[PDB]
Amino acid sequence: MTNILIVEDDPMVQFIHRNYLEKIGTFDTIYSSETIADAKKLLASRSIQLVLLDIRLKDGNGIDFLTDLRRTKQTVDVILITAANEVNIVNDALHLGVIDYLIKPFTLERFEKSIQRYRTKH
Amino acid sequence: MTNILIVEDDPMVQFIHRNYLEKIGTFDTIYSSETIADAKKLLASRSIQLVLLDIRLKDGNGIDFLTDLRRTKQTVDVILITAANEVNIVNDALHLGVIDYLIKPFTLERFEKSIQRYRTKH
Ligand code: BEF
Ligand code: BEF
Ligand SMILES: [Mg+2]
Ligand SMILES: [Mg+2]
C-alpha cells in the first residue's frame, strides 16, 4: 500500500535495498534515483510514502536534501542508510570544520590524539 | 600560547578535560562554561583559540552554537566531545525526524528493524 524511493548512488547498494525490500515484500512500487535532482522529480511526479536516503551522492549531500524536504513540508518518512559517522555529518554535510569528534566515554589516549590533530592543523 | 574554553554542563567532565589539558601542559588559560550563554560571553571578552564542546547543554544545543560561531566567523578551533551519535545529531540537533539511521554495513535483520520502525509509527 506504500511506495518507496531509494536515493543512493552505488548501483550494487541500490540492488540490495531493492532486494531486501522484496524479501519483506509489503510495498507497492519501488523507485530508484542515483541523484538528488532525479529524487526531487520523482517526489513531484509520484506518490511516495518512504525514502531510503544515502548521504554522499554524486550531485550533492543527502542531509541538505532532507533539510529541504522538511522546509517544504514534504509528506514522506525517511530512513538514512549511509556510511557517514558523526564527524562526516558535522564536517562534510554541515561544513562546520571541527578538528575532531570524541565520543564519550573517551580514554586519555583518545583525548591526546584530538589535541595532536589541533597542533598538526596549527 | 593557546587558550581553551571548555563548554560542558557536567562539572565532573569539565574537571577531567581540565586534568587532561594540564597533563599535556601546552596551554595557557583554561576557561569553563556550563552554558551556551556563558560561553558566548567568554568568547566575546577573552582570548580563546580552542573550544572543547559538548552538544547537550541545559540552555541549548552545541551544534546550533557551533553553527553560530561559523556564521559569525569567530576565529576559533573546535573539538566536539559528546555522547551524541549520528541519530542524535540528525533528530535532536537538526530536528529532521528520520525514522532510523542505518550505518553501512548492515545486516538483513537490522534493515528489517528499520522497516518495522516505519510500520510501528503508522
Ligand atoms: F554514500 Be553514502 F552516504 F554511503
Ligand atoms: F551532553 Be553532551 F552531548 F555529551
Ligand atoms: Mg553514496
Ligand atoms: Mg551535556
Author numbering:
A (entry chain A), B (entry chain B): 1 to 122
Which statements did the authors publish about this structure?
MaeK and MaeR exert their function by activating the expression of L-malate catabolic genes (maeP and maeE) and the expression of their own genes upon the presence of L-malate in the medium. Structural and phylogenetic analyses show that L. casei MaeKR proteins belong to the citrate family of TCS, as well as the characterized DcuSR and CitAB TCS. We also solved the crystal structure of the REC domain of MaeR in its activated state as well as the structure of a mutant version defective in the phosphoacceptor Asp. Altogether, our analysis has revealed that MaeKR is a non-canonical TCS conserved in Lactobacillales and that the structure of MaeR acknowledges the α4β5α5-swapped dimers as a new class of dimerization for RRs.
Crystals diffracted to 2.1 Å and the asymmetric unit contained two monomers of MaeRREC. The dimerization interface involves α4β5α5 structural elements, the main dimerization surface exploited by canonical RRs, such as the OmpR/PhoB family, but in MaeR β5 and α5 are swapped between subunits. This swapped conformation is due to a motion of the C-terminal β5α5 structural elements that swap from one monomer to the other by a rotation of about 178° (calculated by Dyndom33), using the loop β4-α4 and α4 as a hinge. To accomplish this swapping, α4 is reoriented and placed perpendicular to α3 instead of parallel, as is observed in the OmpR/PhoB family of RR. This motion allows the interaction of α4 from one subunit with α4 from the other subunit (α4*) and promotes new interactions that involve mainly β4 with β5* (and β4* with β5). Contrary to OmpR/PhoB dimers, where both active centres are placed in the same face of the dimer, they are located in opposite faces of the dimer in MaeR. The swapped MaeRREC dimer displays an interface area of about 2018 Å2 and a solvation free energy ∆iG of about −34 kcal.mol−1, suggesting that it is a tight dimer. The residues Thr82 and Tyr101, which correspond to the Y-T or aromatic switch, are oriented towards (inward) the active site. Interestingly, Lys104 and Tyr101, which contribute to the active site and to the Y-T switch respectively, are provided from swapped elements of the second monomer. In this way, the phosphorylated state cannot be reached unless the REC domain is swapped.
